[PDB]
Write a protein that holds these residues in place. Structure first.
Motif, PDB file in Angstrom:
ATOM      1  N   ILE A   1       2.157  -0.737 -10.808  1.00 16.86           N
ATOM      2  CA  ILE A   1       1.359  -0.387  -9.566  1.00 16.86           C
ATOM      3  C   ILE A   1       0.488  -1.692  -9.123  1.00 16.86           C
ATOM      4  CG2 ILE A   1      -1.010   0.624  -8.994  1.00 16.86           C
ATOM      5  CD1 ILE A   1       0.140   3.169 -10.006  1.00 16.86           C
ATOM      6  N   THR A   2       0.267  -2.709 -10.001  1.00 19.29           N
ATOM      7  CA  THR A   2      -0.206  -3.950  -9.644  1.00 19.29           C
ATOM      8  C   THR A   2       0.671  -5.059  -9.453  1.00 19.29           C
ATOM      9  OG1 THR A   2      -2.190  -3.105 -11.002  1.00 19.29           O
ATOM     10  CG2 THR A   2      -2.612  -4.935  -9.829  1.00 19.29           C
TER      11      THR A   2
ATOM     12  N   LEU B   1       2.381   0.635 -16.474  1.00 26.25           N
ATOM     13  CA  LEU B   1       2.288   1.387 -15.497  1.00 26.25           C
ATOM     14  C   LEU B   1       1.344   0.885 -14.291  1.00 26.25           C
ATOM     15  CD1 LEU B   1       4.301   3.211 -16.966  1.00 26.25           C
ATOM     16  CD2 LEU B   1       2.804   4.928 -16.736  1.00 26.25           C
ATOM     17  N   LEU B   2       0.403  -0.112 -15.022  1.00 24.55           N
ATOM     18  CA  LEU B   2      -0.569  -0.591 -14.206  1.00 24.55           C
ATOM     19  C   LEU B   2       0.303  -1.978 -13.503  1.00 24.55           C
ATOM     20  CD1 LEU B   2      -3.648  -0.270 -13.368  1.00 24.55           C
ATOM     21  CD2 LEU B   2      -2.537   1.339 -14.896  1.00 24.55           C
TER      22      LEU B   2
ATOM     23  N   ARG C   1       2.351   1.726  -3.397  1.00 21.99           N
ATOM     24  CA  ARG C   1       1.519   2.002  -4.518  1.00 21.99           C
ATOM     25  C   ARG C   1       1.115   3.583  -4.340  1.00 21.99           C
ATOM     26  NH1 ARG C   1      -2.304  -3.623  -3.894  1.00 21.99           N
ATOM     27  NH2 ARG C   1      -1.597  -4.551  -5.726  1.00 21.99           N
ATOM     28  N   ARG C   2       0.732   3.721  -3.194  1.00 20.89           N
ATOM     29  CA  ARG C   2       0.479   5.372  -3.081  1.00 20.89           C
ATOM     30  C   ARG C   2       1.582   5.958  -3.332  1.00 20.89           C
ATOM     31  NH1 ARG C   2      -2.146   4.532   0.915  1.00 20.89           N
ATOM     32  NH2 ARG C   2      -1.018   4.643   2.524  1.00 20.89           N
TER      33      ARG C   2
ATOM     34  N   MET D   1       1.758  10.916 -11.011  1.00 18.09           N
ATOM     35  CA  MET D   1       0.832  12.262 -11.539  1.00 18.09           C
ATOM     36  C   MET D   1       1.581  13.283 -11.805  1.00 18.09           C
ATOM     37  SD  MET D   1      -2.200  10.441 -12.480  1.00 18.09           S
ATOM     38  CE  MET D   1      -3.660   9.953 -12.111  1.00 18.09           C
TER      39      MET D   1
ATOM     40  N   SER E   1      -6.636   2.353  -2.312  1.00 18.43           N
ATOM     41  CA  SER E   1      -5.472   1.318  -1.964  1.00 18.43           C
ATOM     42  C   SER E   1      -5.626   0.698  -0.738  1.00 18.43           C
ATOM     43  CB  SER E   1      -4.088   2.155  -1.944  1.00 18.43           C
ATOM     44  OG  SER E   1      -4.382   3.251  -0.981  1.00 18.43           O
TER      45      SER E   1
ATOM     46  N   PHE F   1       4.196   9.416 -20.265  1.00 18.63           N
ATOM     47  CA  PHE F   1       2.591   8.719 -20.063  1.00 18.63           C
ATOM     48  C   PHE F   1       2.608   8.176 -21.607  1.00 18.63           C
ATOM     49  CE2 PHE F   1       2.667   9.447 -15.860  1.00 18.63           C
ATOM     50  CZ  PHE F   1       1.423   9.379 -15.282  1.00 18.63           C
TER      51      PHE F   1
ATOM     52  N   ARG G   1      -5.548  -3.351   0.334  1.00 22.73           N
ATOM     53  CA  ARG G   1      -4.836  -4.059   1.514  1.00 22.73           C
ATOM     54  C   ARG G   1      -5.687  -4.708   2.423  1.00 22.73           C
ATOM     55  NH1 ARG G   1      -3.807  -0.230   6.058  1.00 22.73           N
ATOM     56  NH2 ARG G   1      -5.348  -1.773   6.733  1.00 22.73           N
TER      57      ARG G   1
ATOM     58  N   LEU H   1      -5.049   6.624 -14.292  1.00 16.83           N
ATOM     59  CA  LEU H   1      -3.865   6.628 -14.897  1.00 16.83           C
ATOM     60  C   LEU H   1      -4.033   6.982 -16.345  1.00 16.83           C
ATOM     61  CD1 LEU H   1      -0.882   4.342 -14.888  1.00 16.83           C
ATOM     62  CD2 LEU H   1      -1.378   5.823 -16.443  1.00 16.83           C
TER      63      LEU H   1
ATOM     64  N   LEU I   1      -4.466  16.227 -15.387  1.00 20.12           N
ATOM     65  CA  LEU I   1      -3.515  17.384 -15.248  1.00 20.12           C
ATOM     66  C   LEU I   1      -4.093  18.958 -15.481  1.00 20.12           C
ATOM     67  CD1 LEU I   1       0.061  16.535 -16.670  1.00 20.12           C
ATOM     68  CD2 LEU I   1      -0.745  16.561 -14.120  1.00 20.12           C
TER      69      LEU I   1
ATOM     70  N   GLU J   1      -6.671   2.260 -12.966  1.00 19.49           N
ATOM     71  CA  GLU J   1      -6.335   2.362 -14.651  1.00 19.49           C
ATOM     72  C   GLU J   1      -7.177   3.534 -14.977  1.00 19.49           C
ATOM     73  OE1 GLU J   1      -4.508   0.879 -17.228  1.00 19.49           O
ATOM     74  OE2 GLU J   1      -5.127   2.839 -17.425  1.00 19.49           O
TER      75      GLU J   1
ATOM     76  N   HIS K   1      -4.850  10.849 -17.602  1.00 15.20           N
ATOM     77  CA  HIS K   1      -3.909  11.663 -17.090  1.00 15.20           C
ATOM     78  C   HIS K   1      -3.583  13.158 -17.622  1.00 15.20           C
ATOM     79  CE1 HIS K   1       0.495  13.216 -17.002  1.00 15.20           C
ATOM     80  NE2 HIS K   1       0.224  13.414 -15.746  1.00 15.20           N
TER      81      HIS K   1
ATOM     82  N   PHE L   1      -7.324   7.741  -4.420  1.00 10.45           N
ATOM     83  CA  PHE L   1      -6.527   6.474  -4.537  1.00 10.45           C
ATOM     84  C   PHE L   1      -5.861   6.063  -3.104  1.00 10.45           C
ATOM     85  CE2 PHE L   1      -2.272   4.339  -5.263  1.00 10.45           C
ATOM     86  CZ  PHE L   1      -2.630   3.569  -6.342  1.00 10.45           C
TER      87      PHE L   1
ATOM     88  N   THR M   1      -5.466  11.883  -5.509  1.00 12.64           N
ATOM     89  CA  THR M   1      -4.511  11.180  -4.415  1.00 12.64           C
ATOM     90  C   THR M   1      -5.309  10.517  -3.383  1.00 12.64           C
ATOM     91  OG1 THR M   1      -2.970  12.988  -5.042  1.00 12.64           O
ATOM     92  CG2 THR M   1      -2.252  11.487  -3.733  1.00 12.64           C
TER      93      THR M   1
ATOM     94  N   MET N   1       4.545  13.535 -13.014  1.00  7.38           N
ATOM     95  CA  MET N   1       5.464  13.387 -14.156  1.00  7.38           C
ATOM     96  C   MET N   1       4.999  13.881 -15.478  1.00  7.38           C
ATOM     97  SD  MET N   1       7.917   9.868 -14.212  1.00  7.38           S
ATOM     98  CE  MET N   1       9.095  10.655 -15.289  1.00  7.38           C
ATOM     99  N   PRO N   2       5.546  14.517 -16.593  1.00  5.98           N
ATOM    100  CA  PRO N   2       4.718  15.014 -17.434  1.00  5.98           C
ATOM    101  C   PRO N   2       4.149  14.234 -18.458  1.00  5.98           C
ATOM    102  CG  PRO N   2       7.145  14.990 -18.133  1.00  5.98           C
ATOM    103  CD  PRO N   2       7.151  14.470 -16.643  1.00  5.98           C
TER     104      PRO N   2
ATOM    105  N   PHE O   1       1.668   6.395  -7.160  1.00  4.28           N
ATOM    106  CA  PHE O   1       0.832   7.197  -7.816  1.00  4.28           C
ATOM    107  C   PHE O   1       0.871   8.532  -7.436  1.00  4.28           C
ATOM    108  CE2 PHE O   1      -3.771   8.605  -7.924  1.00  4.28           C
ATOM    109  CZ  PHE O   1      -3.801   8.255  -9.049  1.00  4.28           C
ATOM    110  N   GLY O   2       1.588   8.899  -6.439  1.00  2.00           N
ATOM    111  CA  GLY O   2       1.568  10.291  -6.269  1.00  2.00           C
ATOM    112  C   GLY O   2       2.857  11.062  -6.890  1.00  2.00           C
TER     113      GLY O   2
ATOM    114  N   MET P   1       1.056  -1.196   0.085  1.00  2.00           N
ATOM    115  CA  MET P   1       0.106  -0.071  -0.013  1.00  2.00           C
ATOM    116  C   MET P   1       0.885   1.318   0.048  1.00  2.00           C
ATOM    117  SD  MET P   1      -2.686   1.069   3.011  1.00  2.00           S
ATOM    118  CE  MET P   1      -3.831   2.540   2.986  1.00  2.00           C
TER     119      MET P   1
END
Ligand SMILES: CCCCCCCCCCCCCC(=O)O[C@H](CCCCCCCCCCC)CC(=O)O[C@@H]1[C@@H](NC(=O)C[C@@H](CCCCCCCCCCC)OC(=O)CCCCCCCCCCC)[C@H](OC[C@H]2O[C@H](OP(=O)(O)O)[C@H](NC(=O)C[C@H](O)CCCCCCCCCCC)[C@@H](OC(=O)C[C@H](O)CCCCCCCCCCC)[C@@H]2O)O[C@H](CO[C@]2(C(=O)O)C[C@@H](O[C@]3(C(=O)O)C[C@@H](O)[C@@H](O)[C@@H]([C@H](O)CO)O3)[C@@H](O[C@H]3O[C@H]([C@@H](O)CO)[C@@H](OP(=O)(O)O)[C@H](O[C@H]4O[C@H]([C@@H](O)CO[C@H]5O[C@H]([C@@H](O)CO)[C@@H](O)[C@H](O)[C@@H]5O)[C@@H](OP(=O)(O)O)[C@H](O)[C@@H]4O)[C@@H]3O)[C@@H]([C@H](O)CO)O2)[C@H]1OP(=O)(O)O
Lengths: 559, 559
Positions: free
Chosen positions: A117-118, A113-114, A90-91, A98, B223, A105, B227, B200, B207, B197, B203, B219, B216, A100-101, A94-95, A87
């Motif tokens: 995260i998964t 990217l899933l 993943r958090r 989002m 998350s 992506f 867990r 993501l 943005l 998903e 995005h 999520f 966030t 990143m430019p 994910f923070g 957890m």
């Protein structure tokens, strides 16, 4: 590789210390309940009739309950640590996934990217905690059984003490050879896997030239070397084990031959030799897994490096200082030259595009050479290489990123809706700032009141899980209502709408009339009516403005 | 859910009946190697004797040699049934999966197609062969150890056989409850993965909005739910083990109390009681698997049921018998009614449209209704609902599918290249019919000689993905070369991208002019020079022919 990971488990160490007293107990209970093999045979079923045969069975019962309860506690607390790390990973990703430019992506990954995260984050704690369960609950069985050996029969235990390094490096070398063979063969398996995708992405052009028989003839040879390589995969996998037990049997042979010599005889009773030669049968599981710890502690963290790099992959630059509240002022471009990341062609040349405040420029030409990009530099999705994009007399770089994006509202047929209610999908973010009344009036002013009120709950239906799955023009309309609620001072409409619109073109046109009575509009356009209605048509292709004239002169060039 | 796969596995029965005798032997060898314990603890270290201690290690090796090389044979000769039944499924699928029409590939099942050749098929023999491994080995271990206990001590073996169903059904019910919990927990995990998903994928919109603290927070909440459901995953998984060992320990105490309940008991020597007990510690492995045979074999064939359905789906229909060599005669569309498969909104209205002999007709208007669609029915990708399409005085139902599509050579920017060599890439499915000199003539005539020669191996190089790789204009070149290699009377040609061209467009237009000097052409029009160089134009948009007149009257509509 040796790593850190430890600040991300530091506050969740009260569950791991319990995994240092609930897994050692597991080995202590499968050893002590193997130590009961000497009272039961030597005294119970040997010398005595009973009265130690009635003490023992309750002690076994209790010993397994000790195993089981502490096995549950171990598998629960280790999983608690692994869950509050998975957890926590993943958090934190994910923070960071989002900030990143848009560059990363697109192009770099779509669905990986899933996985990161998964799957990849699941495997951080599913094969590093498995490498910590093993290193204790089977790493303590070694110590417990060796202590059993030294306490019960010390004289033959010295030879098995010499023996363990030998069996150990035998496991290590055979495992290394098997790992090598499998690692070489899996990539060649992957190639013949890609062959099928080549033959299955292109059902067209495999079917248009009548090559089905030839493609089956080749896929025969592809399937053959698919299977003949899995043959050696499974053969190398299943030749190790037999070798492992063979070597372990070679021990039970050496210790048995040593048991033939008189020197050792008269020092072992009915129960002692059984405790011994049972302990050996037991030693073959933990050892097999203790030397494989570096095959999981490494592979797990080796996979973890991928997600530990994106965690540190640089976010999108935020050096702005000025928090622009509202920018109804003019939009200007000044010598704006920019290239897409990972490419080489300059997408935009030295361009000057002075937008009037509140007037709509039409961007004609479907060549896609600087067309779609022209709004991206305004949204700062992709940054700017050279030039200056003036907003209210300053570059976008000076303004804060959040305020910038707050000003602009991307409105396109391909607007991606969210898993929330329709009302909060409209008023996404700042839910306290906007009341339901304002959302409803925005839906009215968007001509979107119909599509919201048509549904069962109407006001707060779920839009996420295909509750209605609104069409492209309808998603366009919900995006307008988003803009009207926001009052986005600068608009950029991609206007990818090309399907027929059954008065949703009237809805769209009245909508953008509201959007452009005030507020600017840098509209990429297809509908020729609005393009003619545009006050300054600017066809821009091949990296440069083709023209800055309205439809009175747009017939020059393509028109 | 019963077999059927038996016809496809039957001729490879030699490996099956060799694995069967190489697993009963594997069980009997362990069984005999525990039985050996009684000589070592009744005759060897009971009554004093060394002769039963010299041969002992030798009959523990040879028994362990028997396991080892029998386990190797079983894992190899069962992989030879699991190799020729995973292979015989892949071939038959992929030979049938090129038969199903392109309707099934597009938007009915696109990315799962590789899974049902690579992933799913391997799980049809990686967990249905696991049944044969764990219903013969561990299914005969039970019989062998029960025979041992009958041969050694009937008195407690009867109560052992009384309890065995009790432990077995206990394992069954607890595993059933675990499975029931895990199903729902898996569903929740998948749903929350889709929720991530959503965040993501959008995005761009996530943005351009204000600030990502709300997302966030959401999520973080979901998350936490991931867990908290993984907690229940692990809890259900780790209540099973301790429950099974606890119950089996109830028997590891029931029989032990029976060992003291009557004066008749205790007549068991150290060897016999060790053989029995050890045999019991052993039975707890095979039972856990024999009770879960239906957990895998029904998780086996059930996936193979999906592969059987996709194997038995209806391949595209072929009933005609006219093997046309060349479609010299004119082609006609007559009141064609048709909608895209999987959808029920009509796409084609009643249209009367003839292709003139050796001349071209172009399509205009990017509505996408009846231009890329009408390009398909000539090739019989999607069959007509009603309205005969006439070629040379016949109809589409009359012709053979292979001969029908032999005529139409499709040229497009999105043409895919097979990963073979260029010599057979151009002449694919036609290697014997063509000479190499012909493809060199075709390359220079197509003006692809530059792309051919600029590669290192050049005339004989590899071209596809996992090869030299090419660009879109070069893909148009390899496609026009494809068409230029003899038969292409009824040309369907894309010309829908209008990508920038460094004098490439001169070569495209000249090459297709050579290819259209003879041979008819249906072109989706994006380059308007070909519109000017068109015998006729039929602008098709909004689902119907709009104006079947030349460019002298096209400018009345969009232009
Ligand atoms: C210096 C070093 C030298 C030393 C080397 C010496 C070498 C030995 C010499 C011989 C060489 C031959 C090779 C060998 O060594 O011989 C092994 C067996 C052959 C016998 C040897 C022949 C004898 C020759 C001597 C002759 C002398 C003349 C083969 C092997 O090695 O099998 C290996 C196997 N070990 C055993 O079977 C020994 C098993 C067998 C038991 C009998 C062994 C016979 C010994 C007798 C001789 C000695 C006596 C003197 O016993 C033990 O362990 C310890 C036993 C020692 C104690 C002695 C008996 C007790 C005495 C009683 C009176 C006497 C091991 O995994 C098994 C473990 O699972 C659970 O663990 P958990 O704890 O649940 O997590 C068990 N829980 C249990 O059993 C719990 C039981 O309920 C206990 C309950 C109570 C008892 C039962 C009551 C019965 C009454 C009920 C009535 C019905 C464990 O028990 C343990 O943990 C310890 C356990 O408490 C022991 C109990 C102790 C009790 C003691 C007494 C109690 C009270 C009595 C009075 C005091 C158990 O050990 O790993 C390898 C890989 O298997 C796997 C893998 O791990 O991946 C497993 C499967 O996969 C999966 C799955 O998909 O299902 C997926 C995995 O991801 C994972 O999930 C895994 C899970 O773990 C399953 O749950 O399962 C499967 O698939 C397989 C496949 O083949 C390839 O994949 O691969 C296997 O190899 P492989 O299969 O061949 O590839």
């Amino acid at each position: 590789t040796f790593r850190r990971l430890w600040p991300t488990i530091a506050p969740f160490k009260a569950g791991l210390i319990v995994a240092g007293v609930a897994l050692i107990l597991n080995a202590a209970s499968d050893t002590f309940m193997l130590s009961l093999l000497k009272p039961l045979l030597d005294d119970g079923f040997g010398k005595t009739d009973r009265s130690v045969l009635v003490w023992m069975p309750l002690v076994v019962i209790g010993l397994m309950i000790l195993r089981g309860i502490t096995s549950y506690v171990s598998s629960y607390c280790i999983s608690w640590v692994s869950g509050k790390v998975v957890m926590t990973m993943r958090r934190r990703l994910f923070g960071h996934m989002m900030g990143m430019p848009v560059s990363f992506f697109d192009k770099q990954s779509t669905g990986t990217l899933l996985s990161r995260i998964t799957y990849d984050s699941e495997q951080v704690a599913s094969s590093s905690s498995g490498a910590l369960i093993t290193v204790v609950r089977e790493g303590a069985s070694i110590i417990g059984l060796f202590i059993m050996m030294f306490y019960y029969s010390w004289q033959l235990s010295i030879i098995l003490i010499v023996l363990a390094p030998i069996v150990s490096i035998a496991i290590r070398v055979v495992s290394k050879r098997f790992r090598n063979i499998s690692k070489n063969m899996q990539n060649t398996m992957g190639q013949v896997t890609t062959s099928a995708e080549q033959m299955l992405k292109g059902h067209k052009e495999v079917l248009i030239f009548g090559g089905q028989e030839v493609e089956t003839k080749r896929f025969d040879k592809v399937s053959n070397r698919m299977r003949l390589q899995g043959m050696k995969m499974v053969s190398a996998s299943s030749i190790s084990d037999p070798i492992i037990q063979l070597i372990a049997s070679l021990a039970l042979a050496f210790v048995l031959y040593a048991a033939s010599f008189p020197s050792v005889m008269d020092s072992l009773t009915a129960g002692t030799i059984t405790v011994v030669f049972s302990s050996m049968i037991a030693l073959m599981r933990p050892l097999k897994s203790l030397t494989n710890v570096n095959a999981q502690f490494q592979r797990g963290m080796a996979a973890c490096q991928t997600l530990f790099t994106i965690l540190d992959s640089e976010q999108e630059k935020d050096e702005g200082k000025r928090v622009i509240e509202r920018a109804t002022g003019d939009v200007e471009f000044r010598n704006v030259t920019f290239t897409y990341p990972g490419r080489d062609v300059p997408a935009l040349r030295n361009i000057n595009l002075k937008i009037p405040a509140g007037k709509t420029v039409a961007l004609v030409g479907r060549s896609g050479s600087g067309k779609s990009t022209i709004a991206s530099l305004i949204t700062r999705f992709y940054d700017i290489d050279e030039g200056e994009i003036l907003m209210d007399g300053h570059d976008l770089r000076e303004y804060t990123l959040a305020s910038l994006r707050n000003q602009v509202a991307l409105v396109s047929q391909n607007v991606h809706l969210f898993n929330d209610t329709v009302a909060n999908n409209i008023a996404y973010a700042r839910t306290e700032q906007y009341s339901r009344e304002q959302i409803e009036e925005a839906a009215r002013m968007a001509y979107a009141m119909d599509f919201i009120n048509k549904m069962d709950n109407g006001l707060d239906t779920v839009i996420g899980e295909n509750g209605v799955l609104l069409s492209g023009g309808q998603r366009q309309r919900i995006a307008i209502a988003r803009a009207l609620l926001r009052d986005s001072p600068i608009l950029i409409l991609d206007e990818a709408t090309s399907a027929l619109d059954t008065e949703s073109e009237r809805a769209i046109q009245a909508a953008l009339d509201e959007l452009q009575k005030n507020r600017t509009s840098l509209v990429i356009a297809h509908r020729l009516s609005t393009i003619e209605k545009a006050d300054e048509i600017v066809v821009v292709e091949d990296g440069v403005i083709v023209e800055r004239g309205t439809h009175n002169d747009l017939l020059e060039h393509r028109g």
